[PDB]
Amino acid sequence: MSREEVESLIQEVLEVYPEKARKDRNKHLAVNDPAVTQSKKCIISNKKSQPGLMTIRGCAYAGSKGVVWGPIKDMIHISHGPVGCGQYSRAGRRNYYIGTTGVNAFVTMNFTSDFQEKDIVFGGDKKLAKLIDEVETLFPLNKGISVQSECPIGLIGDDIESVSKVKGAELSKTIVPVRCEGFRGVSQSLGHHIANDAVRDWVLGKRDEDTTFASTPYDVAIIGDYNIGGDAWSSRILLEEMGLRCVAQWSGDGSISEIELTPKVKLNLVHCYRSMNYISRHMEEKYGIPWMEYNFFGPTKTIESLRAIAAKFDESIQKKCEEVIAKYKPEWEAVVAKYRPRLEGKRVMLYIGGLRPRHVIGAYEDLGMEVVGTGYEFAHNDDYDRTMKEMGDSTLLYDDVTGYEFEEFVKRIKPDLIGSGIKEKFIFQKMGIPFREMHSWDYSGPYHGFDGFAIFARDMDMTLNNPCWKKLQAPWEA
Amino acid sequence: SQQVDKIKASYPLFLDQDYKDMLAKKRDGFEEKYPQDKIDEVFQWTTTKEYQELNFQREALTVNPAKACQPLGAVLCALGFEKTMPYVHGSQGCVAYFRSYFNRHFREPVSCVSDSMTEDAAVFGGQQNMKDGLQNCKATYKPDMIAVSTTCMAEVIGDDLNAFINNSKKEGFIPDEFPVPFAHTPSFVGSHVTGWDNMFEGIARYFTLKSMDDKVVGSNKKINIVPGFETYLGNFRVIKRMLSEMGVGYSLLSDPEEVLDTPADGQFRMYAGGTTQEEMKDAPNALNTVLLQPWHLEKTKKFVEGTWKHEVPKLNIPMGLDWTDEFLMKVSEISGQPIPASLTKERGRLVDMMTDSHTWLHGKRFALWGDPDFVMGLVKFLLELGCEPVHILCHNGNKRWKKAVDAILAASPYGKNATVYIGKDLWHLRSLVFTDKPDFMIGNSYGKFIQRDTLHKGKEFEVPLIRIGFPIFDRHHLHRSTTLGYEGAMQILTTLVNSILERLDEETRGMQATDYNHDLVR
Amino acid sequence: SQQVDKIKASYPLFLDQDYKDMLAKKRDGFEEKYPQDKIDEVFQWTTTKEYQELNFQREALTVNPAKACQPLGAVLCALGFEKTMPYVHGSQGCVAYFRSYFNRHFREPVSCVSDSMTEDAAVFGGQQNMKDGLQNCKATYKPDMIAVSTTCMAEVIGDDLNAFINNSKKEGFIPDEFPVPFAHTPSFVGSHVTGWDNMFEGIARYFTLKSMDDKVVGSNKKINIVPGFETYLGNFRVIKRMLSEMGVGYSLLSDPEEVLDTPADGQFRMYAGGTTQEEMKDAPNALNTVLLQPWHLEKTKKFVEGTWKHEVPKLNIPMGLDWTDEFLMKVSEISGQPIPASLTKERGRLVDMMTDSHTWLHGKRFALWGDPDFVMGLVKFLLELGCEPVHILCHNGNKRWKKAVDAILAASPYGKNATVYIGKDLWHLRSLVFTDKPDFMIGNSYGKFIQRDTLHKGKEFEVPLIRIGFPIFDRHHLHRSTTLGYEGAMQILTTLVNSILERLDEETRGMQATDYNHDLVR
Numbered sequence A: 001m002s003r004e005e006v007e008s009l010i011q012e013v014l015e016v017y018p019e020k021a022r023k024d025r026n027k028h029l030a031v032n033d034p035a036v037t038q039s040k041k042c043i044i045s046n047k048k049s050q051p052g053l054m055t056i057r058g059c060a061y062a063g064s065k066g067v068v069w070g071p072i073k074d075m076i077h078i079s080h081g082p083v084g085c086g087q088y089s090r091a092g093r094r095n096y097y098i099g100t101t102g103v104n105a106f107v108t109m110n111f112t113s114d115f116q117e118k119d120i121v122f123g124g125d126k127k128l129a130k131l132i133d134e135v136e137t138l139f140p141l142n143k144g145i146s147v148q149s150e151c152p153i154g155l156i157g158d159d160i161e162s163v164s165k166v167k168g169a170e171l172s173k174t175i176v177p178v179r180c181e182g183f184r185g186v187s188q189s190l191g192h193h194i195a196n197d198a199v200r201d202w203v204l205g206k207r208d209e210d211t212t213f214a215s216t217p218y219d220v221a222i223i224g225d226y227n228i229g230g231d232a233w234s235s236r237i238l239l240e241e242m243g244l245r246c247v248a249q250w251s252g253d254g255s256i257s258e259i260e261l262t263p264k265v266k267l268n269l270v271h272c273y274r275s276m277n278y279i280s281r282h283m284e285e286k287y288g289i290p291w292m293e294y295n296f297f298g299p300t301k302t303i304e305s306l307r308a309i310a311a312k313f314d315e316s317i318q319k320k321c322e323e324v325i326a327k328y329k330p331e332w333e334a335v336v337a338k339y340r341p342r343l344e345g346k347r348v349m350l351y352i353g354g355l356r357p358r359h360v361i362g363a364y365e366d367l368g369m370e371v372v373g374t375g376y377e378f379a380h381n382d383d384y385d386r387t388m389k390e391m392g393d394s395t396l397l398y399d400d401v402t403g404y405e406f407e408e409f410v411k412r413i414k415p416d417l418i419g420s421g422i423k424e425k426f427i428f429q430k431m432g433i434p435f436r437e438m439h440s441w442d443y444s445g446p447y448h449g450f451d452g453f454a455i456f457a458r459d460m461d462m463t464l465n466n467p468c469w470k471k472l473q474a475p476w477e478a
Numbered sequence B, C: 001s002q003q004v005d006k007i008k009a010s011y012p013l014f015l016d017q018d019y020k021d022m023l024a025k026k027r028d029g030f031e032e033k034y035p036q037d038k039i040d041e042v043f044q045w046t047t048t049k050e051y052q053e054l055n056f057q058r059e060a061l062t063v064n065p066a067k068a069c070q071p072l073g074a075v076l077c078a079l080g081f082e083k084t085m086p087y088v089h090g091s092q093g094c095v096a097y098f099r100s101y102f103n104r105h106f107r108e109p110v111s112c113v114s115d116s117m118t119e120d121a122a123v124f125g126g127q128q129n130m131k132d133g134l135q136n137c138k139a140t141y142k143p144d145m146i147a148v149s150t151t152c153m154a155e156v157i158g159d160d161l162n163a164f165i166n167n168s169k170k171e172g173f174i175p176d177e178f179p180v181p182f183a184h185t186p187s188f189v190g191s192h193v194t195g196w197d198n199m200f201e202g203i204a205r206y207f208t209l210k211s212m213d214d215k216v217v218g219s220n221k222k223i224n225i226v227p228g229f230e231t232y233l234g235n236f237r238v239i240k241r242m243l244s245e246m247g248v249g250y251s252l253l254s255d256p257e258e259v260l261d262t263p264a265d266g267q268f269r270m271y272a273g274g275t276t277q278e279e280m281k282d283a284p285n286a287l288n289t290v291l292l293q294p295w296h297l298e299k300t301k302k303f304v305e306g307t308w309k310h311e312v313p314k315l316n317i318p319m320g321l322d323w324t325d326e327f328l329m330k331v332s333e334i335s336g337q338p339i340p341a342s343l344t345k346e347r348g349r350l351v352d353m354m355t356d357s358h359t360w361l362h363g364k365r366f367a368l369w370g371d372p373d374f375v376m377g378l379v380k381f382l383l384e385l386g387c388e389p390v391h392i393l394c395h396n397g398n399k400r401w402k403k404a405v406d407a408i409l410a411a412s413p414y415g416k417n418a419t420v421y422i423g424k425d426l427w428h429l430r431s432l433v434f435t436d437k438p439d440f441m442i443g444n445s446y447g448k449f450i451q452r453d454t455l456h457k458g459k460e461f462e463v464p465l466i467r468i469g470f471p472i473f474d475r476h477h478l479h480r481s482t483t484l485g486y487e488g489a490m491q492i493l494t495t496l497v498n499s500i501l502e503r504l505d506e507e508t509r510g511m512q513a514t515d516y517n518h519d520l521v522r
């Protein structure tokens, strides 16, 4: 509480850092103050992570294969490089889909060129070509391929672009060369931008000359929703219920077809700003398709969005929007009625990717909880501006928080619940603080929309008020 | 919708009619997916010998590998030493992956750092990353030792770890005497186990090479033990149990059992007990060194025999009856400690369990995969039980290892219809369980998809997976289990027999139809 | 027919067309079985609340009990003492049954004798049977002690065991000093556990009653431990482990862990290690006595407090976190031995396992049965995990015990929808899992038929059985498991969580349909 007590905290933690690291870190720790809209408020983001401080960031590969490209169902994604990236990444993210894995959908699988020494020394550009053929032979039903560059590929300079263009022309298949080399950039963030550009150049344009698709005045597209645990579906159902037609979901239960169809949508609904804003802007300046951001975390936020979205259309839509809000009202109402009392006033600290850290705040407040602190791994100042109007005055803010930092911060803050990633979970459970994975929903159902809200609510209560927590200290000790 | 009183998560939820209908429309409307017929067709195709053949003709594409890159092993190896902090010189992305990969298997925290090399660090060669990274690491997490590993990036650009570290010390970034062992672990060579090997050998060199003068074999009256890449807490513990049970002076080099099982008591212990640096420095003074998993400790073997002058026994991984006997007897010989009646009885009990269950076991055909040693051993035990390891797959296996297993198979009638497969991924195995269908398959969590595939063909085609190995992500706490020694043997035996009985009960659960064989006693 | 190369046993065999057709003709030709419709109808009926009500109105008929007669317990109790031979004075039929019942659960030999009373032995009262039986028993099997139990037959005819035994000795049939403790165990009173209680108390009386003069509490610096009816080798071992781990002088009275786990090494050991007679004679000199399973050691409690003058602590069966803590702390207090960091850490780990798995556990409703103590404890642990023991059934339970459990349930929000059922058989439970369907059921092998029934209604109605308890006949070696202490807790926790995940994987194994939720990591 109080920015003074907080600033002292920040300054205390910084003490262990050797002058160089201390100087840098201070710029990424800040006390929130609404109204402030910039970096002015001691907050700089999207910069090189300090070596040795054990950050929680990832690589460009994770940005492309991991979050953007991997999710596409009817498409084979090749982890081009040594085994590892693909393996560690195999079925890690819960980007749910509907398909016969192995025949038409391939998400679960880990296709890799399993680079071996001779492939580096001589460049596996030929290996890739041969690989592709093997793919077409063994997976006839794929509607496209994508090579995800791992560090090696970027260094040795393999002309993957050419291999893709030549094989693509020959086989008449869309083969997308992505330069998401882990070292390129500073986190998964650039990976997003790269993946987006790849889509723009190799996939989107495919249907520009085609006009066969029957469009409607209510054709919308959900972009930036990876259907984690079903998130996209739970969001889609609402939109369509209010008369809209979701032509495509970007990296949810996504197929290459619907991605190519996207340029025909009347409006683009951006959920995850940080990852899709790039392509969203491109679609606008080119196809003249307007885009707006929205939030489905919690009823207040969901309803807010539903209305704002319907407002972009005519009355039939707006009228329906209200019917939808009306329909789900007793439900989410019953949800808060049951859970809020159990979570009322309980303080929460967060740290996630580049959206959720601010987006889920609404949902928390809907259950009467207070987010005393939050931060991102790869968010740019774009996000931080938006973050400040969400965080209550004097709440702690952090960018690319070091492991040590999060620990010390948590020590004084003493939140009732913490929400972060897998690399964090057990650390805080050890400390006796109820933890909940905000990346993978801790293997739980969707959180998006009303249906997801009920689940989110149950989960928070389930953990936060679990009897296991009282039993941390053995009776024979005090 | 949702019924507050009985909330439905993703699973029962998306089965609701309004949801189903939505997906149907989505599919038919913008997915353009192949007709259900084509899908069904291509699927049935992927199960034929014709497909399998083309599948095995693969020379580039690797699908669903059964391995991981070197650095992962280096890290695990690093975690086995007291207050040591794994440091992977290279891209930060890897470290995040390593941590999580282990996080999920152990359901414990996994401390590891990267010096976060980026674009210009790769072009200009990240020597600064090493300097700052080391300084920052020590200052922040206060480790007593830092074990440096690498990423393909750092391996391609030839970053001289040694030069960097040396300069890091000379330029005052860290105390000159601070233990900073390193190891080159190219992702694109060998596999995770090789990483473990390299990392260990490097550490062994660090605390030994120079100080070899005052060392004398046997002087410490201990027997060095190298576990190698081990992901079962029980496997470390059983070895230490038996050794202590015999009263054998030993020294387990790289013991992360503590780090991987910190008690949850409101306190977070980043580091935990492990192999003390002194144990490593004193290691050459040991009577000898036993490598629990020889097949991936090759480099270490050469260093131990060459520099430490230890006559490392040609022992197989202590798995199953025979091999455990050999292990104990060898240890007994080296330490002069007679096998206690304690262990003798334990051996007898396992035999008893074997005799009690031989009926159901005898004849059961299995498909399996995992690291070389693990597999090799699993095979031997399977043979001892009277089972048939028809499909033995070890992606990270080599020519010599294949021969070894083949010889083992040729030593028993039960190995008659077995076939060892090296450099083969799980997609290859998928075909094997379709064409030459076994009863069950023993492996890591990745096999659950093979079982999914098999069942999709038909119930009688479903080949149940028995989770033994690494990694196991879809089952809580199996990492506590044991596979080594009679204890591990007993567990495996029990697990197998019960797995068989389970499937039988299911198959015979059909009332009126198949429940006639649903026996109360088995 | 049969294909020599691939022989089909009863299961796949009778599924062959010629066989099916034969059965069809047999049924339609001479069985006169009720029409499939009527069968299906009456079945659906047996699942309704209407049926369940009539089912619970039963006052005479007992269907599928969850208990056994006293003598069984007496025998198990007998087997816990060094070179002791269980002798059941009565009909030989019982003994054959007892032996086999245990044979199947332990998969070990079960030595027990009967003095084979027949028609005229019942009419004339088998005193001779006792005389000859004892003489013959000693001479043939050379036991050091003979523990006499009874059969309803001998209990009805009022055969004075004591008189018989006394006369057996006086008439020179056996040495007067040969230890022949006895106990009346009427089949028709209490249950098997009561038999265990009676048998123990009788033995305790035998080596104590008279010699109580020289006895002084605490003089031996040991803590007596009475396990009671225990059918898990691990349960005896864990208690002994912890006690030794604390350095607590103890004396486990009735320890058949050895007898029930003889090593198979070409030799048959009829008798094995057990509680030495001296330990029993010296037992009164102990600091105190802890009853691991108080609810069925009632008679023993009174004898210990009354004659031994030991202030027996009011401790619950050491099951689950809390109760294990209480047990340790109490033992600590009595022995003055501080709980070692060894155990403290172990407790912490269990908590850690709980925290790692609390997600899947929280909310899962269970149905369960077994002996009073076992059940009571299982319930407590379930509550600690955040699960809901909705149907708590203990056939051999009593009014006071029900209250105890009820109070335990009233102490936690999770017990809110639980209901304790005493004097209820598995047929009653069958209805409970149909009407108020739980997620899984924890119990002995007898429940496999309940799961068969449930599945027959429909897949979504199937309530999987988790085999924990006694007896377990359809699964090899589960009798080695542990349920007591943190160790037992950890095992149970693991078992439960994994059982949940298993069923989930099955439910989500449907490709295209439900496999979308088939996560690799959980």
Ligand code: CFM
Pocket: A063, A067, A093, A188, A226, A228, A272, A273, A274, A275, A352, A353, A354, A355, A356, A357, A438, A439, A440
């Ligand atoms: S850590 Fe999202 S910017 Fe990205 S995998 Fe998670 S807080 Fe990502 S909302 Fe998303 S589905 Fe994410 S949870 Fe943007 S896609 S690089 Mo880790």
Ligand code: CLF
Pocket: A058, A059, A060, A061, A062, A081, A082, A083, A084, A085, A086, A088, A149, A150, A151, A152, A180, A181, A182, A183, B069, B070, B071, B091, B092, B093, B094, B095, B097, B150, B151, B152, B153, B187, B188
């Ligand atoms: S930051 Fe990312 S995961 Fe790292 S390498 Fe770079 S793209 Fe890949 Fe790959 S095989 Fe293993 S995990 Fe690497 S050491 Fe190479």
Ligand SMILES: [Ca+2]
Pocket: A426, B106, B107, B108, B109, C352, C353, C356
């Ligand atoms: Ca843990």
Ligand SMILES: [Ca+2]
Pocket: B352, B353, B356, C106, C107, C108, C109
């Ligand atoms: Ca046996």
